[PDB]
Design a binder for this molecule. Structure first.
Ligand SMILES: CC1(C)Nc2nc(N)[nH]c(=O)c2N=C1C(=O)NCCN1CC[C@@H](SC[C@H]2O[C@@H](n3cnc4c(N)ncnc43)[C@H](O)[C@@H]2O)C[C@@H]1C(=O)O
Length: 162
Protein backbone atom coordinates (compact mmCIF):
# COMPACT_ATOMS: atom_id res chain seq x y z
CA UNK A 1 0.00 0.00 0.00
CA UNK A 2 0.79 3.69 -0.56
CA UNK A 3 -1.87 5.19 1.66
CA UNK A 4 -0.62 8.77 2.03
CA UNK A 5 -1.50 11.53 -0.43
CA UNK A 6 0.64 14.65 -0.67
CA UNK A 7 0.60 17.73 -2.89
CA UNK A 8 3.94 19.25 -3.95
CA UNK A 9 4.60 22.54 -5.74
CA UNK A 10 7.50 23.01 -8.18
CA UNK A 11 9.00 26.26 -9.44
CA UNK A 12 11.95 27.17 -11.66
CA UNK A 13 13.14 30.49 -13.06
CA UNK A 14 16.64 29.69 -14.45
CA UNK A 15 17.67 28.09 -17.73
CA UNK A 16 15.36 25.56 -19.36
CA UNK A 17 12.64 26.00 -16.76
CA UNK A 18 10.32 23.38 -18.19
CA UNK A 19 13.16 20.84 -18.24
CA UNK A 20 14.01 21.20 -14.54
CA UNK A 21 10.33 20.84 -13.70
CA UNK A 22 10.06 17.80 -15.97
CA UNK A 23 13.15 16.18 -14.52
CA UNK A 24 11.95 16.89 -10.97
CA UNK A 25 8.74 14.94 -11.60
CA UNK A 26 10.73 12.18 -13.30
CA UNK A 27 13.15 11.86 -10.38
CA UNK A 28 10.30 11.78 -7.84
CA UNK A 29 8.43 9.23 -9.93
CA UNK A 30 11.43 6.95 -10.20
CA UNK A 31 11.42 6.41 -6.45
CA UNK A 32 9.45 3.21 -5.78
CA UNK A 33 7.84 4.80 -2.73
CA UNK A 34 6.30 7.64 -4.71
CA UNK A 35 3.58 7.40 -7.34
CA UNK A 36 2.72 10.60 -9.22
CA UNK A 37 -1.08 10.59 -9.48
CA UNK A 38 -1.88 13.95 -11.11
CA UNK A 39 0.00 16.97 -12.51
CA UNK A 40 -1.33 20.50 -12.99
CA UNK A 41 -0.82 22.61 -16.05
CA UNK A 42 2.36 24.69 -16.15
CA UNK A 43 1.86 28.36 -15.36
CA UNK A 44 4.16 31.29 -16.04
CA UNK A 45 4.16 33.57 -13.04
CA UNK A 46 5.56 36.97 -12.13
CA UNK A 47 8.31 36.68 -9.50
CA UNK A 48 6.97 37.27 -5.99
CA UNK A 49 8.88 38.77 -3.08
CA UNK A 50 11.92 39.73 -5.19
CA UNK A 51 10.82 41.03 -8.57
CA UNK A 52 14.24 41.73 -10.17
CA UNK A 53 14.52 38.37 -11.90
CA UNK A 54 13.02 36.13 -14.55
CA UNK A 55 9.41 34.94 -14.50
CA UNK A 56 8.76 31.46 -13.06
CA UNK A 57 7.31 28.27 -14.42
CA UNK A 58 5.19 26.76 -11.62
CA UNK A 59 3.17 23.55 -11.32
CA UNK A 60 1.79 21.28 -8.60
CA UNK A 61 1.71 17.51 -8.43
CA UNK A 62 -0.27 15.03 -6.39
CA UNK A 63 1.55 11.89 -5.24
CA UNK A 64 0.77 8.70 -3.36
CA UNK A 65 3.50 7.54 -1.00
CA UNK A 66 4.33 5.25 1.85
CA UNK A 67 6.98 7.79 2.92
CA UNK A 68 6.55 9.67 6.18
CA UNK A 69 6.55 13.49 5.98
CA UNK A 70 10.21 13.72 7.02
CA UNK A 71 11.04 10.92 4.56
CA UNK A 72 9.19 12.71 1.77
CA UNK A 73 11.00 15.94 2.64
CA UNK A 74 14.44 14.30 2.37
CA UNK A 75 13.54 12.89 -1.07
CA UNK A 76 12.50 16.26 -2.43
CA UNK A 77 15.70 17.81 -1.08
CA UNK A 78 17.75 15.09 -2.77
CA UNK A 79 15.91 15.87 -6.02
CA UNK A 80 16.58 19.59 -5.59
CA UNK A 81 20.22 18.71 -4.99
CA UNK A 82 20.39 16.51 -8.08
CA UNK A 83 19.11 19.40 -10.20
CA UNK A 84 21.75 21.84 -9.00
CA UNK A 85 19.82 23.94 -6.49
CA UNK A 86 22.28 26.09 -4.59
CA UNK A 87 21.36 25.93 -0.90
CA UNK A 88 22.38 29.55 -0.38
CA UNK A 89 19.92 31.11 -2.83
CA UNK A 90 16.94 32.58 -1.01
CA UNK A 91 15.38 35.38 -3.06
CA UNK A 92 17.11 35.23 -6.43
CA UNK A 93 16.92 32.86 -9.38
CA UNK A 94 17.22 29.11 -8.84
CA UNK A 95 16.99 25.95 -10.93
CA UNK A 96 14.29 24.20 -8.91
CA UNK A 97 12.19 24.46 -5.73
CA UNK A 98 9.99 21.76 -4.14
CA UNK A 99 7.46 22.63 -1.42
CA UNK A 100 5.36 20.10 0.44
CA UNK A 101 1.94 21.79 0.45
CA UNK A 102 -0.37 19.12 1.91
CA UNK A 103 0.14 15.70 3.48
CA UNK A 104 -3.13 13.80 3.98
CA UNK A 105 -4.96 16.10 6.40
CA UNK A 106 -2.07 16.32 8.81
CA UNK A 107 -1.03 19.51 10.62
CA UNK A 108 2.76 19.32 10.93
CA UNK A 109 4.80 21.82 12.95
CA UNK A 110 8.35 20.45 13.07
CA UNK A 111 11.47 22.62 13.22
CA UNK A 112 12.09 21.92 9.53
CA UNK A 113 8.63 21.07 8.18
CA UNK A 114 5.45 23.14 8.33
CA UNK A 115 2.36 21.63 6.67
CA UNK A 116 0.03 22.91 5.33
CA UNK A 117 2.64 25.14 3.76
CA UNK A 118 2.36 28.50 5.58
CA UNK A 119 2.51 30.61 2.39
CA UNK A 120 0.40 28.49 0.06
CA UNK A 121 -2.76 30.57 0.44
CA UNK A 122 -0.77 33.78 -0.17
CA UNK A 123 0.69 32.64 -3.51
CA UNK A 124 -1.35 32.55 -6.72
CA UNK A 125 1.42 30.51 -8.35
CA UNK A 126 0.65 27.75 -5.80
CA UNK A 127 -3.11 28.08 -5.41
CA UNK A 128 -4.00 28.25 -9.12
CA UNK A 129 -2.31 24.95 -10.13
CA UNK A 130 -3.30 23.32 -6.82
CA UNK A 131 -7.01 24.03 -7.50
CA UNK A 132 -6.64 22.49 -10.94
CA UNK A 133 -5.90 19.11 -9.29
CA UNK A 134 -7.47 19.35 -5.81
CA UNK A 135 -11.27 19.61 -5.59
CA UNK A 136 -11.44 20.05 -1.79
CA UNK A 137 -9.60 23.35 -2.18
CA UNK A 138 -11.61 24.01 -5.34
CA UNK A 139 -14.68 24.64 -3.21
CA UNK A 140 -12.92 26.43 -0.40
CA UNK A 141 -12.05 29.19 -2.81
CA UNK A 142 -14.40 30.94 -5.19
CA UNK A 143 -13.89 30.56 -8.93
CA UNK A 144 -13.74 34.37 -9.27
CA UNK A 145 -11.24 34.48 -6.40
CA UNK A 146 -9.04 32.22 -8.55
CA UNK A 147 -9.23 34.31 -11.73
CA UNK A 148 -8.94 37.41 -9.56
CA UNK A 149 -5.60 36.26 -8.12
CA UNK A 150 -4.47 35.22 -11.63
CA UNK A 151 -4.93 38.85 -12.75
CA UNK A 152 -3.39 40.57 -9.75
CA UNK A 153 -0.26 38.40 -9.45
CA UNK A 154 0.24 37.73 -13.16
CA UNK A 155 -0.32 33.98 -13.55
CA UNK A 156 -0.97 32.56 -17.01
CA UNK A 157 -1.15 29.09 -18.52
CA UNK A 158 2.17 28.30 -20.20
CA UNK A 159 1.54 24.66 -21.16
CA UNK A 160 -1.75 22.81 -20.90
CA UNK A 161 -1.75 19.52 -19.05
CA UNK A 162 -3.24 16.59 -20.91
C1 LIG B 1 11.37 33.72 -4.52
C2 LIG B 1 10.00 33.11 -4.55
C3 LIG B 1 9.27 33.54 -3.34
N1 LIG B 1 9.36 33.73 -5.70
C4 LIG B 1 8.63 32.97 -6.54
N2 LIG B 1 7.91 33.61 -7.51
C5 LIG B 1 7.22 32.82 -8.32
N3 LIG B 1 6.48 33.37 -9.31
N4 LIG B 1 7.18 31.47 -8.23
C6 LIG B 1 7.90 30.77 -7.25
O1 LIG B 1 7.81 29.61 -7.26
C7 LIG B 1 8.66 31.61 -6.39
N5 LIG B 1 9.35 30.97 -5.45
C8 LIG B 1 9.96 31.63 -4.59
C9 LIG B 1 10.47 30.80 -3.43
O2 LIG B 1 11.02 31.35 -2.49
N6 LIG B 1 10.27 29.50 -3.47
C10 LIG B 1 10.85 28.61 -2.60
C11 LIG B 1 9.81 27.78 -1.91
N7 LIG B 1 10.17 26.95 -0.84
C12 LIG B 1 11.01 25.91 -1.14
C13 LIG B 1 11.23 24.99 -0.03
C14 LIG B 1 11.67 25.57 1.28
S1 LIG B 1 13.47 25.67 1.38
C15 LIG B 1 14.05 25.98 3.04
C16 LIG B 1 13.63 25.11 4.22
O3 LIG B 1 12.28 25.05 4.32
C17 LIG B 1 11.94 24.04 5.17
N8 LIG B 1 10.58 23.74 5.00
C18 LIG B 1 9.61 24.03 5.93
N9 LIG B 1 8.42 23.68 5.57
C19 LIG B 1 8.58 23.14 4.34
C20 LIG B 1 7.70 22.57 3.41
N10 LIG B 1 6.37 22.47 3.62
N11 LIG B 1 8.14 22.11 2.24
C21 LIG B 1 9.43 22.21 2.02
N12 LIG B 1 10.38 22.73 2.79
C22 LIG B 1 9.92 23.17 3.97
C23 LIG B 1 12.93 22.87 4.88
O4 LIG B 1 13.30 22.27 6.06
C24 LIG B 1 14.10 23.68 4.23
O5 LIG B 1 15.19 23.76 5.00
C25 LIG B 1 11.03 26.89 1.51
C26 LIG B 1 10.68 27.71 0.28
C27 LIG B 1 9.51 28.63 0.76
O6 LIG B 1 8.34 28.35 0.55
O7 LIG B 1 9.94 29.64 1.37
Amino acid sequence: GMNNIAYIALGSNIGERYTYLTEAIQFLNKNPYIKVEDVSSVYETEPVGYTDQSCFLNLVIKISTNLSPQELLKVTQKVENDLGRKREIRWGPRTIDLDILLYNQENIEAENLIVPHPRMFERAFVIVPLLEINQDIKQNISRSQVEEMKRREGVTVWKQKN
